[PDB]
Design a protein around this nucleic acid. Structure first.
Lengths: 122, 176, 209, 38
RNA sequence: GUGAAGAGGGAAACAACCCAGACCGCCAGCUAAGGUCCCAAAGUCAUGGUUAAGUGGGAAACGAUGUGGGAAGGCCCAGACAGCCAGGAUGUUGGCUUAGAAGCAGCCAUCAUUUAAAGAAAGCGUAAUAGCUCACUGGUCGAGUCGGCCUGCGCGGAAGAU
RNA sequence: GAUGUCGGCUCAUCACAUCCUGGGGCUGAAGUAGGUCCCAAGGGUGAUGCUGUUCGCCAUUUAAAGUGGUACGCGAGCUGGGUUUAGAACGUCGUGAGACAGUUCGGUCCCUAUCUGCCGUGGGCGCUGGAGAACUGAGGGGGGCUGCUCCUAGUACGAGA
RNA sequence: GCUGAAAGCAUCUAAGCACGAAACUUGCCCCGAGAUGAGUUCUCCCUGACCCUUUAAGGGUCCUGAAGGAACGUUGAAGAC
């Protein structure tokens, strides 16, 4: 479960390396963001000659959590870390062009089909 | 007052009967019964009805006038009845009478189905107008009213159910 | 419609062919035997009073034994009533079994919830706890304030505070009927129902529609 | 509807009527003039 | 003046308001202020009127065909008020910024005249004169009608916390 | 011959002069979205940075982040940051002791609940011979929030957006 | 809003008739006959003598001891007791 003050690794080539969740969108008093959910982040660290700078505020979509996801039969999938894909703040499309690491089928929702297509696993 | 003091004349072939306060009217279009309020007395004079106030009642004259108008409309109803014409204007607005149920299509995402009361019969001469015929004036007026209430005429094109004779007095948006 | 009296056998899952796990509560409902029928003339309302299970005859008291003798049914472990709708009638001694729910697909289940005992305000009423540190002294799970100053001068009726929680009648509504198995005397409903394993349950067709 | 403590006739076509104890102004000319006491 | 330093009865309860100044006793009577349907003693008393809000039993400027009563006044059976089947013989494209705004941008001209009466205008559509009702007084219908003054009682104005 | 004082925490409760959601009238209301007024109190009504702060300003949300009363609700429920004991210092005033609604660092928060109240849980007696069960239901209480997407339909509306 | 006079017109109102909201009464869940206004239904149990006196009442002795209950014990996903 991702909440405010959580540090996420970044799972694309947008230039960011560490981001921090500053809000969980979509509901008053909403507490946690799972795997399909959109959060707002600030960039705590980025590579030098990159696309996004350290300090910008923008949206992201969680793609891996080590809380994990439950499948309808009861099985779970847990990762070793929390990761997101950066989206631009207005037209929530991914900023990067490559996706690193696996994702899950929770993303196959006609809105993140780009992330599904670009991902190595799922 | 003046209304009450003008007797209503029953035509030939219409029958009246006064049970104390209840008046019942036979006619070719059927039956109309109504109980008058206690402050008004009515006499069947020669082929006519006369209305007056009871004694010991305030505002008896107003009640007499109301009763006179009610009975005049009653006898007018049991012969030829009354009719009301409604129009539907707007693209795709249609009406169709099936049995005693009116099918309307006032641009909704659901069908609208109006059940007619006992004495009211509807018929649609064309696709976009309705004609109600009935004996009792109040019931047919009520039916026309809540038929209009489904989509009352909006003030920019007059779209919606209107009375065939009523004016709409549309207006226009701003400039720019 | 009337319902039946069953026993919470336990909990398990049903695996569906498309790969979905359904958590089911298993209610064993044996034959329910109509012990009394009440009508407007004699009792002022229509209902049928049933029993179920069985109990050792050495502690069926003579009043209860006599009550069962009129119906001519075997003594059960209890008695429960069901209000009758306008349509159905039942006869004394008739046996009602699980295929009543053959095509119901939504039931309410009533039971006695597990008894938590004297519970404090945090567990009972979801009260926030106070600070664990920062100088807090002997007040970590206490309820806090319970009223205003002099103007009411009293604690209001119904104030939430510590006391007995659990061990009371609870109804869970609109539970899906996963399956009805007539020969094994079983009802499989989706989800969890009140009470511990081995306790009585009252299953009725869903009223919430 | 203008809800105000002083309702008045505004044109010739506007009219005063006491409906259910409360004084109202209903005007056939245009709905801008429709008033109620309150 | 009263309380202080005065009790008793009324004002629901309420030193200081109203009635009235307790020497003691009575299972006697008359009254005061207040009252008389039940709590709760005594008129479900009598005669005449008013009010319809539970006004009485909280609150103003102001608003209103609420009703009750006066003093006067017009319009009228030669036909009033309302409603209707009632509409119209300006030289007229008679002067505007104009190759018609002479009424509807803004002024004068308002001169010749028509009816039995009618109109250089109040609107609207159209900025637009081209269409509606005009304050017309011609007819039908045939008894009251229209405002203002004084005054009694009511109505709205009127939203708060256990 | 003592009624503990600001803010926070916990727990609330009522009013309606309604923030959202519900219903309507008018609009200088085409639609979408608004403005204003009337009815409505059922439920709901943010977690962060700075500061002791209430407030406020910001950053991000949300359908909305209501306005008030309740000893500015609540210290025999918590805190003790502010503030008004004793220490010390700065600026300033004073010859000085000392002082400042100036600042600055430090600085003891007691109570085993009799009564009312409230949350639970029993005993006695009653209910008209005694007893075991199952009920009726006069009354109480709980709950009552809402987003987004899709279809209707890119339809109605608009010149188009 | 409909019909409709007072006020030959109009008028949602005076008589009469319709609609109309998360508010209200229900509908859903729980408690509930100490509801002293103490309710209802079903089932079960007990039908022996005698004395006394202040009697219309009662007191007492002998015989009897039901249906049930409680107590005790082994305990419980019930519970501070």
């Amino acid at each position: 479960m991702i909440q405010e003050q959580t540090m996420l690794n970044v799972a694309d080539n947008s230039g960011a390396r560490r981001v921090m969740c500053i809000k969980v969108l979509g509901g008053s008093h909403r507490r946690y963001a799972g795997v399909g959910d959109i959060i707002k982040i600030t960039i705590k660290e980025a590579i030098p000659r990159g696309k996004v700078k350290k300090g910008d505020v923008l949206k992201a979509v969680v793609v891996r959590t080590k809380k994990g996801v439950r499948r309808p039969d009861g099985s779970v999938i847990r990762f070793d870390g929390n990761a997101c894909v950066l989206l631009n703040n207005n037209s929530e499309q991914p900023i990067g062009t490559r996706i690193f690491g696996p994702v899950t089928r929770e993303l196959r929702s006609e809105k993140f089909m780009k992330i599904i297509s670009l991902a190595p696993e799922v | 007052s003046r209304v009450a003091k003008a007797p209503v004349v029953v035509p030939a072939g219409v029958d009246v009967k006064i049970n104390g306060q209840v008046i019942t009217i036979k006619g070719k279009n059927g039956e109309l019964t109504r109980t008058l309020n206690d402050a008004v007395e009515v006499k069947h004079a020669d082929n006519t009805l006369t209305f007056g106030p009871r004694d010991g009642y305030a505002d008896g004259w107003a009640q007499a006038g109301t009763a006179r108008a009610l009975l005049n409309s009653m006898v007018i109803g049991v012969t030829e009845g009354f009719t009301k014409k409604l129009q539907l204007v707007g693209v795709g607005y249609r009406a169709a009478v099936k049995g005693n149920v009116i099918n309307l299509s006032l641009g909704f995402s659901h069908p609208v189905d109006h059940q007619l009361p006992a004495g009211i019969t509807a018929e649609c001469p064309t696709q976009t107008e309705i004609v109600l015929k009935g004996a009792d004036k109040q019931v047919i007026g009520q039916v026309a009213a809540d038929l209009r209430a489904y989509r009352r005429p909006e003030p920019y094109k007059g779209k919606g159910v209107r009375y065939a004779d009523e004016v709409v007095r549309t207006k226009e948006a701003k400039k720019k | 419609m009337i319902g039946l009296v069953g026993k919470k056998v336990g909990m398990t899952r049903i695996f569906t062919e498309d790969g979905v796990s359904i958590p089911v509560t298993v209610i064993e409902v044996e034959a329910n035997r109509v012990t009394q029928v009440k009508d407007l003339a004699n009792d002022g309302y229509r209902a049928i009073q049933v029993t179920t299970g069985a109990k050792k005859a050495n502690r069926v008291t003579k009043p209860e034994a006599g009550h069962f003798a009129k119906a001519g049914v075997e003594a059960g472990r209890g008695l429960w009533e069901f209000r009758l709708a306008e349509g159905e009638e039942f006869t004394v001694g008739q046996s009602i079994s699980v295929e009543l729910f053959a095509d119901v697909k939504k039931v309410d289940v009533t039971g006695t919830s597990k008894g938590k005992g004297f519970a404090g305000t945090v567990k009972r009423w979801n009260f926030r706890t106070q600070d664990a540190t920062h100088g807090n002294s002997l007040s970590h799970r206490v309820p806090g304030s319970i009223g205003q100053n002099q103007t009411p001068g009293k604690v209001f009726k119904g104030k939430k505070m510590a006391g007995q929680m659990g061990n009371e009648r609870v109804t869970v509504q609109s539970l899906d009927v996963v399956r009805v198995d007539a020969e094994r005397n079983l009802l499989l409903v989706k989800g969890a129902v009140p009470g511990a394993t081995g306790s009585d349950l009252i299953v009725k067709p869903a009223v919430k529609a | 509807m203008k809800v105000r403590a002083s309702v008045k006739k505004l044109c010739r076509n506007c009219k005063i009527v006491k409906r259910d104890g409360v004084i109202r102004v209903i005007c056939s000319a245009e709905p801008k003039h429709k008033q109620r006491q309150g």
